[PDB]
Design a protein around this ligand. Structure first.
Ligand SMILES: [Mn+2]
Ligand SMILES: [Mn+2]
Lengths: 431, 430
């Protein structure tokens, strides 16, 4: 069974001595510094020019990441305060405070989208398609089964972990986030294989590439995560705070996708109160709602309330199943146990029908397949014959072990802004 | 002046006091303020608002987030020292060091939220419209202060308006805590008199006549010191305003320099030359030399210089803490820095190579045309709301005379750079 004293590790990669919570300066608390390191990092700043499914210029992945980190800070503060009541020795002996849990969830949430390719899950699938059926199929017999699985099922979560921890000359350990933050980041503590060994949400995807396996082994050992398999296919039970990072993300994309689609016209405004009345009625001020004269103001009032309702419930679900999560025996997400799962489901379904299957979004994702394939092919052909005049040009333009080279090409194409990607694609194509 | 009152948790419309000891620690009013700004439409609109350069990767949103991060750190470090200097603030009123960081962080997060597009040129295009352009005609129908609001339109005062604008069903706007609004107020003065002293608090003004009564309520709750010797009102800065200003000062000095270097406008060699004193005692030379990319090298130096400037600003603040509390502090915290010469060399280099570059002058020249055109259409429709064309302009751009003109200026100010150009193009047929 896992221990909250080890799960709240302040260790950073390469540390030679232990970091005790009591001995920290509260003005420079490890977990809070993690948040700043992310805000100021080049991968986070690049989210300015990375659009979500809809490209209205005011629907960015930076805003999503920001709002997920805010909701995440709330979730972790409230759970953190209840956990210190249950296990008083964590504050009495180890010096932990409730804002520590707030900070861990907030930093992991803030970073949760940092490694995703452009164009959504279509972007991930364009990359996988490239190595499964495109030019990149040629590498299959030179890679291990799990190196190849990293590629053909390329996963933005796992690319995220690489962005946060990648060593470079003069920058060992990447952003060097606290291990507790890295533990909460990891929604899927498993390798690419075996694929979907169970129906648990933690088994649905994978969380780290082969290139990062040794790194997460260090994190998992320090946190004391529970070994879920020892069959040479490593996987662990989720760090408890990872459920809150997931819940914050789930809450935001459920409610705020709905809001956005109402504002963009894709969802008639009538559905707003219809799908959300159960989630708001115990807290809504009817007088205030009927005075608001603008649709955007009405639906954002409803969204603030729906999000408040879901945070409060998610805290309760965590505390109820707290011992099962600590044992690694909790099989669902926090949101899967919500009493509003009927309402959440109808919301998600309407959002899919009217937004994610809208003609604009389908078009952006189809063009994304072509943009990502073209960039991957220019990179891989340059890797294969670095001697030609053209491939040396391509090398100066796009990038000035075989598996490490391929995964790095994937990481770099994935972290390109939409601006650099399209401009470089157009250049390659003569447009 | 008393830190008990300066740290007020009041929200607009309140009928009873808000005791710090009775706040829920997971719903603290100062931290709620941050989240309200983060989720607000005006803050989201900074996504499509460019700063000096249009690279899509230098937005007013990223600047606002980084100023707020540097402000949280300042508020935090200063807060602990204030609480150790004034222990009754914690043992009696229940304030905590994280409270100062939250106030500074919220005020800093919002500090650019009312700024017009196209930078300081945007502000001057709005003023010229009312001083010598079409808007000149209203001068005889407005008090001196009402007109001065227009001819010297100020992004800072527009930000206060945005944070507090009442609308049906939304009294008080974001309803931020009064301590946060105090921390936001860099220029607690009205548009007149114009630059009374050479003090930075008097270089600009901070609230329009439309918001004068709101800030009067704020200044009274917080117990700010009236420094005005006339009917013209003026207050000494809320002490935390010095930290909000310092966070902004540190970020635009160092990060503009970093941006200019990474963009290509400033040669790389100037990085170490201009920042060696700011980083000499904390830089790891082997780490630096091991960094291969210039971007990563300048990021390292930027993090180091900000670290030095934050520490020095905290020390400066506590050194002059009683003078700031008494409203007798005459400078910015960064004005008192030992690296004033390095800072000035850095600012003057950025001015020469970034702010006067051809690409920035053209954007500003174009910004003038865009803002003047939108202002004239809205004002002509205000004057003759009866014609078919002016009703059309009313539906597209906006679906008491001073109230109407200050509103038109606020709306033109908060338009994204994108909406400004598109609406400008429709008004011109493209
Ligand atoms: Mn997300
Ligand atoms: Mn600024």
């Amino acid at each position: 069974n896992a221990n909250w004293e080890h799960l709240l590790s302040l260790k950073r990669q390469g540390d030679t001595a232990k970091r005790l919570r009591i001995e920290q300066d509260d003005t420079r608390l490890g977990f809070e510094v993690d948040y700043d390191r992310i805000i100021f990092s080049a991968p986070f700043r690049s989210l300015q020019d990375k659009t979500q499914v809809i490209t209205d210029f005011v629907h960015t992945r930076l805003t999503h990441s920001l709002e997920v980190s805010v909701v995440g800070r709330s979730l972790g503060r409230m759970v953190g305060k209840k956990l210190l009541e249950k296990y008083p020795h964590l504050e009495q002996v180890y010096g932990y405070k409730f804002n520590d849990f707030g900070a861990i969830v907030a930093a992991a949430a803030l970073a949760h989208d940092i490694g995703n390719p452009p164009f959504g899950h279509s972007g991930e699938k364009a990359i996988g398609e490239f190595f499964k059926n495109g030019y990149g199929k040629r590498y299959k017999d030179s890679l291990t089964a799990k190196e190849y699985q990293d590629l053909i099922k390329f996963e933005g979560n796992a690319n995220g972990f690489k962005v946060l921890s990648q060593s470079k000359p003069g920058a060992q350990g990447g952003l060097r986030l606290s291990y507790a933050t890295l533990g909460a980041f990891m929604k899927y503590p498993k390798e690419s294989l075996p694929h979907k060994p169970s129906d648990h949400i933690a088994d649905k995807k994978y969380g780290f590439f082969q290139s990062e396996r040794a790194l997460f082994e260090d994190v998992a050992q320090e946190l004391g995560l529970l070994k879920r398999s020892t069959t040479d296919d490593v996987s662990w039970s989720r760090h408890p705070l990872a459920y809150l990072v997931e819940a914050a993300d789930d809450i935001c994309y459920t409610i705020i996708d709905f809001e956005d689609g109402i504002n963009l016209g894709l969802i008639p405004e009538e559905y707003a109160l219809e799908y959300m009345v159960k989630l708001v009625g115990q807290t809504i001020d009817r007088n205030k709602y009927n005075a608001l004269q603008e649709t955007s103001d009405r639906v954002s009032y409803l969204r603030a309330l729906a999000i408040g309702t879901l945070i409060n419930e998610s805290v309760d679900t965590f505390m109820k199943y707290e011992e099962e999560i600590l044992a690694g025996t909790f099989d669902q997400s926090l949101i899967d146990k919500s009493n509003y799962q009927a309402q959440i489901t109808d919301i998600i379904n309407l959002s899919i029908e009217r937004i994610y299957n809208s003609r604009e979004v389908i078009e952006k994702e189809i063009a994304g397949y072509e943009i990502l394939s073209t960039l991957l092919e220019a990179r891989c052909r340059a890797l294969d014959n670095n001697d030609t005049h053209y491939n040396q040009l391509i090398q100066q333009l796009l990038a000035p072990s075989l598996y490490e080279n391929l995964i790095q090409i994937c990481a770099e194409v994935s972290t390109m802004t939409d601006g650099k990607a399209l401009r470089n694609y157009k250049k390659i194509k003569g447009l």
